[PDB]
Amino acid sequence: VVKFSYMWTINNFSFCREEMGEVIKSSTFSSGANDKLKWCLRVNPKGLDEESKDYLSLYLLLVSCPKSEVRAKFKFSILNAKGEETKAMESQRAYRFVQGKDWGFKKFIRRNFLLDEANGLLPDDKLTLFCEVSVVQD
Amino acid sequence: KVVKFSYMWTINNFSFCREEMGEVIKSSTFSSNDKLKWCLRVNPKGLDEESKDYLSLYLLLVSCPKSEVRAKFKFSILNAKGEETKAMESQRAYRFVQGKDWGFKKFIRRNFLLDEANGLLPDDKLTLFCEVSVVQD
Amino acid sequence: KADTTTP
Amino acid sequence: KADTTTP
């Protein structure tokens, strides 16, 4: 079981030009260990379609070509100004990842809740995401 | 009894980090235990005058452990392809009490890091990688 | 439940 | 080797 975490900040989130269906890609990161598998995070700031146009969509994607089958559990969450976890969403089981396969949450969080300054999820208009993954299978 | 886990962290607009010698950039906490919390501390312009030409990187134990903690660690920078570069590891295990840090005063030369020819700040982003192996008791 | 954008 | 900023 390979465990790894990635913290990713999107500056000036409320100004992102990405429209519905378009994606903001994180830096490519690595689970390390023996395989050195490569992953990235993908955010749809205005969802993928009209069904989820009210939501931010968040997906974990396997970038590299795995030597064997890859199964992984994951958890996404937002860090407030105090650095505390909030609005977490996690997989209740492991999912199979082939190269280029994405798994995540089409409706991770409502845009209205995120941009409401009372919730403190965009200090200095920065969106900080925290991704925790457990690769169960190679 | 060895628990292994890794943490990655992308600092946006790294060249614009107004920190001077002694100033600190702190990561978020990370773990996996789930109770034992760690954090990374970065001195972008060096820790002291000896390391003025370097960036300093430290691993810090944040939580209060209920038993003795000894950990090995490895720091590296990820290039745009996510590959580990400029790796530097402790080689040996170190004892960690709450608030104790271990790391490298001279993790990487500031001139090598800031030179665009070396390609370690893609889009002015510094992505730090830390792998920890810990044994309690 | 987690979802995907591909088959 | 690794260093610390603490005793």
UniProtKB/Swiss-Prot annotation, chain A:
Outcome reported for the amino acid change (mutating Y55C): In NSDVS2; dominant-negative, increased BET proteins stability
Result for mutant: F105A: Strongly reduced affinity for substrate proteins
Tissue specificity annotation: Widely expressed.
Localization: Nucleus; Nucleus speckle; Cytoplasm
Span of domain MATH: 3-133
Consequence recorded when altering R93Q: In NSDVS1; gain-of-function, reduced BET proteins stability
Region described as Required for nuclear localization: spans on this chain: 43-138
Effect of W103A: Strongly reduced affinity for substrate proteins
Positions of region (Important for binding substrate proteins): 95-105
Self-association state and partner proteins as the record states: Interacts with GLI2 and GLI3. Homodimer and homooligomer. Heterodimer with SPOPL. Each dimer interacts with two CUL3 molecules. Part of cullin-RING-based BCR (BTB-CUL3-RBX1) E3 ubiquitin-protein ligase complexes that contain CUL3 and homodimeric SPOP, or the heterodimer formed by SPOP and SPOPL, plus a target protein, such as MACROH2A1, PDX1/IPF1, BMI1, BRMS1 and DAXX. Interacts with IRF1; this interaction mediates IRF1 proteasomal degradation. Interacts with HNF1A.
Family, similarity comment: Belongs to the Tdpoz family.
Domain comment quoted from the record: The BTB (POZ) domain mediates dimerization and interaction with CUL3. The MATH domain mediates interaction with protein-ubiquitin ligase substrates, such as MACROH2A1 and BMI1.
Function: Component of a cullin-RING-based BCR (BTB-CUL3-RBX1) E3 ubiquitin-protein ligase complex that mediates the ubiquitination of target proteins, leading most often to their proteasomal degradation. In complex with CUL3, involved in ubiquitination and proteasomal degradation of BRMS1, DAXX, PDX1/IPF1, GLI2 and GLI3. In complex with CUL3, involved in ubiquitination of MACROH2A1 and BMI1; this does not lead to their proteasomal degradation. Inhibits transcriptional activation of PDX1/IPF1 targets, such as insulin, by promoting PDX1/IPF1 degradation.
Misc remark: Antigen recognized by serum from scleroderma patient.
Pathology noted in the entry: Nabais Sa-de Vries syndrome 1: An autosomal dominant disorder characterized by global developmental delay, impaired intellectual development, speech delay, and variable behavioral abnormalities. Affected individuals show congenital microcephaly and dysmorphic facial features, including round face, small palpebral fissures, highly arched eyebrows, and short nose.
Name the record gives this protein: Speckle-type POZ protein
Species in which this protein is naturally found: Homo sapiens
Lineage: Eukaryota, Metazoa, Chordata, Craniata, Vertebrata
GN (gene name): SPOP
Swiss-Prot record, chains C, D:
Tissue: Ubiquitous.
Transmembrane segments: none
Origin: domain of life: Eukaryota
Subcellular location: Nucleus; Chromosome
Self-association and partners: Interacts (via bromo domain 1) with GATA1 acetylated at 'Lys-312' and 'Lys-315'. Interacts (via bromo domain 1) with GATA2 acetylated on lysine residues. Interacts (via NET domain) with CHD4 (via KIKL motif). Interacts (via NET domain) with SMARCA4 (via KIKL motif). Interacts (via NET domain) with NSD3 (via KIKL motif). (Microbial infection) Interacts with the Integrase protein of Moloney murine leukemia virus (MLV).
Domain notes: The Bromo domains specifically recognize and bind acetylated histones.
Family in the record: Belongs to the BET family.
Medical condition linked: A chromosomal aberration involving BRD3 is found in a rare, aggressive, and lethal carcinoma arising in midline organs of young people. Translocation t(15;9)(q14;q34) with NUTM1 which produces a BRD3-NUTM1 fusion protein.
Record function comment: Chromatin reader that recognizes and binds acetylated histones, thereby controlling gene expression and remodeling chromatin structures. Recruits transcription factors and coactivators to target gene sites, and activates RNA polymerase II machinery for transcriptional elongation. In vitro, binds acetylated lysine residues on the N-terminus of histone H2A, H2B, H3 and H4.
Record protein name field: Bromodomain-containing protein 3
Native species: Homo sapiens (Human)
